[PDB]
């Protein structure tokens, strides 16, 4: 009989609360059984008791590595159900902060993936840049990570009068940090022997198992939601989609690094093409009026009262809205019954399908290889468990 | 539009073969990594000397809550209960009644800081700028019961932090 | 950075690049922590006339979904859900990494 072992939840390589029950013959993995739900907080049932504005901060806590992306997905779904449109400046700000969030998420993923393998230093090198990006978050919103900045009508506040310059100064030095990380990892032979030909998944198996994002592009599938189904001013920016060849950990690492480079490219374009105007839909029955008008106008005060007590009513209907979050296709199936509260909100996270495919990906590998596969799948359990 | 990340092949000329052999037998890329780590050692660290140095913050930063007053000393809160209605975490408890002079004022205003998510929705909903999230973040306690604020604690927070709260609002209210 | 020139040369040689050009630490090139007040322009619907809300009401333009052959209620060439997706191009900027 094989030896049964508990990997996590109190394990540095478990990436949080995961109970991986493995059967081992020696150190060769015979079966992985992921036990999840150790971070199941009942987010969907809790959302069913909130207004559409009240339920927005839950999406920040879903994927606590990529926050503005969850906010953007939920806002897009609610905007689609409301039949309203965000202003152009709001959309450009949304895309800019989505790319900044992508940089944050890719730094997190790559550095902790290398930390699991044994490379501890790039984590420290890149978390200074992560700290500067949290400074950007805090300056625009007042919170370092849980901003609640993106709303279902646009954004909450406008950019402060020195933010764009500071984002530019940050952006022209980040490529050197990526280069130093690549000098540490890309051509290292230990890194390659740890990552090359580990967790190889075929394109058809990836398609049938429900993978998305890099997990697809590592296998050579040419699919990206920002290119095929754009949801913002993304159809006005120019960038390339990194595509893998071997479907292994090393190819996905290269893909994530090149996605960081393309995010820098998109950020430069967004900084150049920021338009003027308002930041939220000019419809006071969806977005709150400005505080001066609320304090001087009767209709503005009535609408402020009714928006912050009851909230806007969304017309009845169901939508499935998905975006290209840094970990893959992040989606929401939202069902509205015509009231100020969502009737149902199902949250689709790529980590669910990726962790379901972990057992398929770990066949014929060792314990360290399974650690590498868990790292390369880019799993955060706030969205897997919800 | 797309690019390939790992779809290149190496040359087969004897010079490149000898270069690869020398790389394999003499560990050139490992020396390059060693060089990179060495470069960092001579650089200035990013560490700040806390608590004698503090990280940068913004006027929009939202921390500990506070109830404010008018310049005459009258409480701004009019017991409208919009902050309680909007609170995502249901962390605000309010009870009100007419005062001795007929003023609309609260008798109970409690915020559960262990329930609160520090989203700032309450200060956006307030129509008189009574409840705010101050700049303070160094208010960690030793018991759970110390994080259950009542009206006296919040008014004391406002009286303690008003000088800075008013200055922060002065630099932010034109963005709201 | 206040590093000496010898140490600067040592770091530049060890890393193989020029470090002083792009420094991770922000010294004085950043924006001021005190800024002038903004003005924040108003939105399109701030008109005084010709601004009836019924002409700009997105929520009331929503309709129940259209019914395509409810069951309870000529060669006919076959169709796809959408035209076939167009093949991607290989990055005239940089095709290979």
């Amino acid at each position: 009989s094989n030896l049964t072992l508990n990997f996590g939840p109190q394990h540095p390589a478990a990436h949080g609360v995961l109970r991986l029950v493995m059967e081992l013959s020696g150190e060769m993995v015979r079966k992985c059984d992921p036990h999840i739900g150790l971070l199941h907080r009942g987010t969907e049932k809790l959302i069913e008791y909130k207004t559409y504005l009240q339920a927005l901060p839950y999406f920040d806590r879903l994927d606590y590595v990529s926050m503005m992306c969850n906010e953007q997905a939920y806002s897009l779904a609610v905007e689609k159900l409301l039949n309203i449109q965000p202003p152009p400046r709001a959309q450009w700000i949304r895309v800019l902060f989505g790319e900044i969030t992508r940089l944050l998420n890719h730094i997190m993923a790559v550095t902790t993936h290398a930390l699991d393998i044994g490379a501890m230093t790039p984590f420290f090198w890149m978390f200074e840049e992560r700290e500067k990006m949290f400074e950007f978050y805090e300056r625009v919103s007042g919170a370092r990570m849980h901003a609640a900045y993106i709303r279902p009508g646009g954004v909450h506040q406008d950019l402060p009068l020195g933010l764009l310059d500071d984002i530019y100064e940050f952006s022209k030095n980040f490529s050197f940090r990526i280069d130093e990380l690549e000098e540490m990892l890309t051509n290292n032979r230990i890194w390659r022997n740890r990552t090359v030909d580990i967790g190889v998944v075929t394109a058809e198996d990836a398609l049938n198992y429900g993978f998305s994002g890099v997990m697809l592009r590592g296998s050579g599938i040419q699919w990206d939601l920002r290119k095929t189904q754009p949801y913002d001013v993304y159809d006005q920016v120019e960038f390339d989609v990194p595509i893998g060849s071997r479907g292994d950990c090393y190819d996905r690492y290269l893909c994530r690094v090149e996605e960081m480079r393309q995010s820098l490219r998109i950020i430069s374009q967004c900084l150049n093409k920021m338009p003027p105007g308002e930041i939220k839909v000019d419809d006071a029955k969806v977005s709150p009026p400005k505080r001066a008008e609320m304090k001087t106008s009767m209709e503005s005060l009535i609408h402020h009262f009714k928006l912050y007590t009851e909230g806007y009513q969304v017309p009845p209907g169901a939508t499935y809205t998905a975006i290209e979050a840094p970990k893959g296709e992040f989606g929401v199936y939202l069902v509205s019954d015509g009231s100020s509260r969502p009737y149902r909100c199902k949250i689709k996270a790529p980590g669910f399908a990726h962790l379901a495919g972990l057992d398929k990906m770990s066949k014929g590998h060792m314990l360290a290889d399974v650690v590498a596969i868990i790292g390369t799948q880019d799993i955060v359990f706030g969205e897997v468990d919800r | 539009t797309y690019k390939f990340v790992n779809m290149r092949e190496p040359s087969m000329d004897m010079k490149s073969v000898t270069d690869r052999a020398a790389q394999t037998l003499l560990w050139t890329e490992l020396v390059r990594g060693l060089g990179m780590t060495l470069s960092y050692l001579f650089r200035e660290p990013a560490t700040i000397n806390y608590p004698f140095e503090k990280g940068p913050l913004s006027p929009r930063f939202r921390g500990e809550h506070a109830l404010r007053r008018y310049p005459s000393g009258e409480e701004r809160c009019i017991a409208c209960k919009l902050c309680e209605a909007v609170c995502p975490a249901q962390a605000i408890t309010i009870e009100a009644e007419p005062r001795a002079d007929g003023s609309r004022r609260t008798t109970r205003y409690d915020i559960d800081m262990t329930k609160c998510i520090y989203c700032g929705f309450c200060q956006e909903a307030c129509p008189v700028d009574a409840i705010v999230e101050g700049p303070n973040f160094e208010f960690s306690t030793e018991t759970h019961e110390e994080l259950l604020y009542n009206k006296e604690k919040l008014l004391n927070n406002g009286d303690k932090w008003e000088a800075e709260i008013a200055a922060n609002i002065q630099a932010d209210y034109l963005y709201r | 950075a206040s590093a000496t020139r010898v140490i600067q040369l040592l770091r530049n040689w060890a890393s193989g690049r020029d470090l002083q050009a792009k420094l991770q630490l922000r010294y004085q090139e950043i924006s001021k922590r005190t800024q002038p007040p903004p003005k924040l322009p108003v939105g399109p619907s701030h008109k005084l006339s010709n601004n009836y809300y019924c002409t700009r009401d997105g929520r009331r333009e929503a309709m129940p979904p259209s019914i395509v052959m409810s069951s309870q209620k000529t060669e006919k060439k076959a169709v796809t859900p959408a035209p076939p997706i167009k093949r991607w191009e290989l990055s005239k900027d940089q095709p290979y990494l």
Partner: peptide
């Protein structure tokens, strides 16, 4: 009758931002 003041890129634009990989030769034969 003051004009609109808002966070905008400067007239013209920002300077170019490098994003491509840069790993120098740094080797002997």
């Amino acid at each position: 009758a003051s004009k609109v003041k808002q966070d905008m890129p400067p007239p013209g634009g920002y300077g170019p931002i490098d994003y491509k990989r840069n790993l120098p030769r740094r080797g002997l034969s």
